[PDB]
Design a protein around this ligand. Structure first.
Ligand SMILES: Cn1cc(-c2ccc(C(=O)Nc3ccccc3N)cc2)c2cc[nH]c2c1=O
Length: 124
């Protein structure tokens, strides 16, 4: 199909370890973006088939979405907060490199990214 297998969300060979920053990323950062009115296009992998975007996964080499990030946090996939922040950054980058500037989806991403950066500015 137009769609790749979704990203893995569990790392079983990794030890399970909480950190203050990972708790913050799940319980403050992800939670705040997840509940936002503009979160909905970002809560699951882009379904290029249903959306008829045949070039999406030609342009986007590293798919990422908030649902994947949420599950990765819930399964303690990330070794540290920077790995999680990188996935958020990738999700926004994908939106900005695929969609035309000023598209509704880009304006949605920009609003979510601003909130993300504001919360990251207070990472413990
Ligand atoms: C990240 N991202 C997401 C999306 C994206 C857009 C729409 C949906 C979606 O579920 N639409 C919908 C609304 C109401 C009823 C049924 C459906 N299917 C999901 C995703 C997208 C589209 C162009 N470009 C991007 C884009 O970059």
């Amino acid at each position: 199909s137009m769609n790749p297998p979704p990203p893995e969300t569990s790392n079983p060979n990794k030890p399970k370890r909480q950190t203050n920053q990972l708790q913050y990323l799940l319980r403050v950062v992800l939670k705040t973006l997840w509940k936002h009115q503009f979160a909905w296009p970002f809560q699951q992998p882009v379904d290029a088939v249903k959306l008829n975007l045949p070039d999406y996964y030609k342009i986007i080499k590293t798919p990422m979405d908030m649902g994947t990030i949420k599950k990765r946090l819930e399964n303690n996939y990330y070794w540290n907060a920077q790995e999680c922040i990188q996935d958020f950054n990738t999700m926004f980058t994908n939106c900005y490199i695929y969609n035309k500037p000023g598209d509704d989806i880009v304006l949605m991403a920009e609003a979510l990214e601003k909130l993300f950066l504001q919360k990251i500015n207070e990472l413990p």
